[PDB]
């Protein structure tokens, strides 16, 4: 199974805008929510600082997504679904994907409770839910922070097993190659890269530079 080429995906994450939480009161649940929100904002900040040949393909795709208009088109694409095939302006057809949706949870659940009742939370399941949802973003941030924004092998925090197989079942390849790549997913994690690309227009996007074996 000789790796002869690359297939650059694009993995997005809908971020939120943390508007200043104007509520006074330091109950334990509110304090834990505040600590998690602070860790979230810190993750976004370190990622923005992380942004601001084996990865030549991912580098090129990152420079293309930095052009004005491209994120808009990807966002419109992955709008109602959680997977699309957007064709970038330079002719290449990239396979976007939306592996996490944190804007939804943060806004809809947290922001009302934080703003209306002056930060009075009732149950303790919401804080565990939020830290569970946020741990994946924090761990992507940690991996990028340590590896200088280019991570190999692609861990299970970047691209889980179900999502790696959903990516493999949509690549433009024969059925034999899909079968091979689905039977050796650990060797496909050990052979790719995860370039960190952009934070812009309220979204986090990184490029997963999967391999493709033309010789089998």
């Amino acid at each position, epitope marked *: 199974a000789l790796r002869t080429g690359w297939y650059t995906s694009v993995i997005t994450i809908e971020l939120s*805008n943390i508007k200043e939480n104007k509520c006074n009161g330091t109950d334990a649940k509110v304090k834990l929510i505040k600590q998690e929100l602070d860790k979230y904002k810190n993750a976004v900040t370190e990622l923005q600082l992380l942004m601001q040949s084996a990865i030549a393909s991912g580098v090129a795709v990152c420079k293309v997504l930095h052009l004005e*208009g491209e994120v*808009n*088109k990807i*966002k*419109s*694409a992955l*709008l*109602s679904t959680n997977k699309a095939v957007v064709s970038l302006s330079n002719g290449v057809s990239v396979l976007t994907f939306k592996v996490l949706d944190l804007k939804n949870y943060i806004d809809k659940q947290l922001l009302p409770i934080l703003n209306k009742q002056s930060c009075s939370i009732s149950n303790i399941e919401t804080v565990i839910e939020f830290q569970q949802k946020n741990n994946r973003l924090l761990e992507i941030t940690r991996e990028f922070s340590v590896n200088a924004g280019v991570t190999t092998p692609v861990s299970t925090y970047m691209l889980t097993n179900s999502e790696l197989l959903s990516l493999i079942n949509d690549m433009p390849i024969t059925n034999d190659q899909k079968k091979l790549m689905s039977n050796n997913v650990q060797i496909v994690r050990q052979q790719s890269y995860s370039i960190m690309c952009i934070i812009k227009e309220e979204v986090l996007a990184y490029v997963v530079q999967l391999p493709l074996y033309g010789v089998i």
Partner: antibody, heavy 116, light 107 residues
Framework: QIQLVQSGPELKKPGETVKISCKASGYTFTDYSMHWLKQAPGKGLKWMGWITTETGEPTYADDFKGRFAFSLETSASTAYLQINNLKNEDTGIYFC?????????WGQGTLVTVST | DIQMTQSPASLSASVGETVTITCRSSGNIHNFLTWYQQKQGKSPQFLVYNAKTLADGVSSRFSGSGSGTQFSLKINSLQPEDFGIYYCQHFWTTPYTFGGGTKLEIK
């Protein structure tokens, strides 16, 4: 809740200088670069350019090069345009917009008429 | 420099008919196109996020379709509200262009 309130109406004379401002509330101003859209009486809508809200670097459409100048104040969260050497043809409605999911978001216009 | 053209430069319909507007791109804008409607002296409010997936807040009678070089907005029923001027724009690559405009008036 994303708002882009714009300046008021104006009346100038050919050969003057004008500055139209666009205030942007409801989001982190530094996320989306702001785009400028010119309308015209009877003609169609015209997109003229944008200005990045991080570096301020502007870029212009080939019909709106030479005199139009975009600028912003990151702190105030507002961006403005400047149309040097007004002419009888620069009359119309000038729009400030940013990228929504697919389409734009238009703030109210500023009818800028140039008569003598 | 993809330039768009709308076929019904004028229009006239009843208060219960279904009317269909079309745009033809001068290039392959794969899927990216949108339809604004401008009321009597307002700012163009968009109706669809994309050629197909309409935008939240609007009524369900608007139904867009198309891909590549032939797109179609369909007002499945007219009311006093659905009257104005309808433009169409690509957002595939810069500079962005609009259709000539489709003026819709009562029959």
């Amino acid at each position: 809740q994303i708002q882009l309130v714009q300046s008021g109406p104006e009346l100038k004379k050919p050969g003057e200088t004008v500055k139209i401002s666009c205030k942007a509330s409801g989001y982190t101003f530094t996320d989306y670069s702001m785009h400028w859209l010119k309308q015209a009486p009877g003609k169609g809508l015209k997109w003229m350019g944008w200005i990045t809200t991080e570096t301020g670097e502007p870029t212009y459409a080939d019909d709106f090069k030479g005199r139009f100048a975009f600028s912003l104040e990151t702190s105030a969260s507002t961006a403005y345009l400047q149309i040097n050497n007004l002419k009888n043809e620069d009359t119309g409605i000038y729009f400030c917009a940013r990228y929504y999911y697919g389409p734009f978001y238009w703030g109210q216009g500023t009818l800028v008429t140039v008569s003598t | 420099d993809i330039q768009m053209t709308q076929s019904p430069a004028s229009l006239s319909a009843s208060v219960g008919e279904t009317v269909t507007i079309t745009c033809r791109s001068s290039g392959n804008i794969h899927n990216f196109l949108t339809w604004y409607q401008q009321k009597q002296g307002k700012s163009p409010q968009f109706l669809v996020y994309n050629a197909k997936t309409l935008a939240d807040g609007v009524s369900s009678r608007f139904s867009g379709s198309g891909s590549g070089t032939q797109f179609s907005l369909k007002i499945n029923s007219l009311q006093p509200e659905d009257f104005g001027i309808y433009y169409c724009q690509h957002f595939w690559t810069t500079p962005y262009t609009f259709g000539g405009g489709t003026k819709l008036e009562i029959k």
